[PDB]
Design a protein around this ligand. Structure first.
Ligand code: YBC
Ligand code: YBC
Lengths: 133, 133
């Protein structure tokens, strides 16, 4: 599957910027952030058509392997077969996700990690760049 | 200790660009590329003053945990404190390392890996950006 990065040491307030190519026939893509694959403060899942949703962003946490309560957004600034960029940061209370087209939303920080050490990508998205603050 | 990235799927001819800030008091830094931590097609180690060398790039391979034969460059386009970007690519014959100041050198491809899946950074270099093209 997609790129996996560890040992990231992203601190509160630091921005993690990811640019990638959405596949022409994309169904969805994922960015996961947290401590490890079983402990995610953010699962970020734009669904073009996948997992029972169309053109919807679904976010969740994972704690000791258990998905939390889902959150769905009402905006979908992504298109199959294009370049897309997202930027993420956090504090003890919320993650902030910066989308294309100036849209931004918050997702609650339910793990309270001191630092985000793990990121992974998956689905129909080819990472072109990852920038750290 | 720095970022570790896996599942990179870097293919021959593709460029991996890594940009970081060299510490103001830097002794050395490392970029490791290969299959996993024990199997490196390139250990890239600019030594300001470390491991017995001054202002020298040392490169090596690692196969099943064992270091190969060292290769030393004469060029040293790095300065303590300064941002630096290094770009790496490979073919079946050699890795090519593109340095600051327009310099490039080749290092033999000793492991014949189909793809480079692993990168890690270490020492006195704070990673700012990793790009794939
Ligand atoms: O909540 C987020 C998750 O929702 C469901 S599981 C789920 C369903 C209903 C509820 Cl009420 C809950 Cl709490 C969880 C997805 O299957 C899962 N998911 C996508 C993928 C994936 C990997 S690569 C690709 O393109 N999609 N891997 N796991 C995840 O997005
Ligand atoms: O060949 C490359 C290696 O040369 C010597 S061991 C070595 C010595 C003599 C010979 Cl003949 C051989 Cl074959 C191997 C270094 O100790 C080692 N090295 C650096 C570091 C390190 C980590 S972060 C930082 O800034 N430097 N961790 N291991 C590596 O550079």
């Amino acid at each position: 599957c997609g790129l996996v990065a560890s040992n990231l040491n992203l601190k509160p307030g630091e921005c993690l910027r990811v640019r990638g190519e959405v596949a022409p026939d994309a169904k969805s893509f994922v960015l996961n952030l947290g401590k490890d694959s079983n402990n995610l403060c953010l699962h970020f899942n734009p669904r073009f058509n996948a997992h029972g949703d169309a053109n919807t962003i679904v976010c969740n946490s994972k704690d000791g392997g258990a998905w939390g309560t889902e959150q769905r957004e009402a905006v979908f600034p992504f298109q199959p077969g294009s370049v897309a960029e997202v930027c993420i940061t956090f504090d003890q209370a919320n993650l902030t996700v910066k989308l294309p087209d100036g849209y931004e939303f918050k997702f609650p920080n339910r793990l309270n990690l001191e630092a985000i050490n793990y990121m992974a990508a998956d689905g129909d998205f080819k990472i072109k760049c990852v920038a750290f603050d």
